[PDB]
């Protein structure tokens, strides 16, 4: 029934999972989220996550879309990404061309702090750290971005809009109740159609709060409260991928 996830309810429901932000950064966010939302002409802007660096100066990353339309069977959102070392001032994350988008997936290890860092890869190729961060955010968003099913609907002119009459998802424990963001409302694609053991759901029947954690990307959490229909998600931790999933499970 909600139209945009709160930044306070997300931090409250995901505090236990370690998805927390500093109090000073929380106040700075509360002040400087609308400023960037108006400076960029975006109708929706929410905090996407927080990535750890070799310094204490983690990257806070917020995403925001202005239009969201159906295109070749994919719900394409025209997202813009912004980063900030502190909660006050935001900078932009320019998209990455395919050559460097493939030369950035081979660079591993947790990032440094200064976004003006050049990695050198193999003749030597110089790649900016902001490109690597953009690649990691794109990979996590492709693999993970999760919303409850039927929470979006298709109107005339083929635009995906929130379902104002969404009554909630029965059986919140089941993974079938949740879907990726880029799945069309008509298609019956959910997280069940992913790999069998890559999503863990723990549901408290009493308080009516379900919690979905990504095991392929260990730092992605998504909560869904059903008594009042409120769902949110956050990624906290480094952006690296968990390759050896078969051994761990």
């Amino acid at each position: 029934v909600q139209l945009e996830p709160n930044i306070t309810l997300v931090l409250k429901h995901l505090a236990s999972c370690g998805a927390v932000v500093s109090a000073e950064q929380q106040a700075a966010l509360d002040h400087s989220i609308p400023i960037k939302r108006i400076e960029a002409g975006l109708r929706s802007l929410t905090l996407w996550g927080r990535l750890t660096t070799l310094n204490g100066k983690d990257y806070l990353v917020a995403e925001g879309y202005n239009v969201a339309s159906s295109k070749e069977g994919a719900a394409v959102y025209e997202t813009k990404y912004f980063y900030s070392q502190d909660g006050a001032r935001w900078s932009d994350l320019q998209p990455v061309d395919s050559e460097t988008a493939t030369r950035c997936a081979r660079i591993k290890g947790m990032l440094s702090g200064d976004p003006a860092k050049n990695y050198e890869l193999e003749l030597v190729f110089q790649i900016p750290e902001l490109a690597v961060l953009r690649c990691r955010v794109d990979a996590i968003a492709t693999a993970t971005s999760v919303i409850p099913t039927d929470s979006t609907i298709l109107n005339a002119a083929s635009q995906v809009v929130p379902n104002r009459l969404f009554a909630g998802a029965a059986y919140p424990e089941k993974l079938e109740s949740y879907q990726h963001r880029f799945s069309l409302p008509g298609s019956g694609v959910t997280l069940s159609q992913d790999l069998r053991g890559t999503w863990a759901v723990q549901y408290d029947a009493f308080k009516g709060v379900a919690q979905v954690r990504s095991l392929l990307f260990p730092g992605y959490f998504f909560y869904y409260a059903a008594n009042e229909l409120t769902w949110g998600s956050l990624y906290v931790g480094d952006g690296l991928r968990n390759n050896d999933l078969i051994f761990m499970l």
Binding site: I153, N155, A156, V161, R164, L165
Partner: peptide, 11 residues
Amino acid sequence: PVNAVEALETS
């Protein structure tokens, strides 16, 4: 409704 014209086809 909020956005009434589109709510005709949606709701």
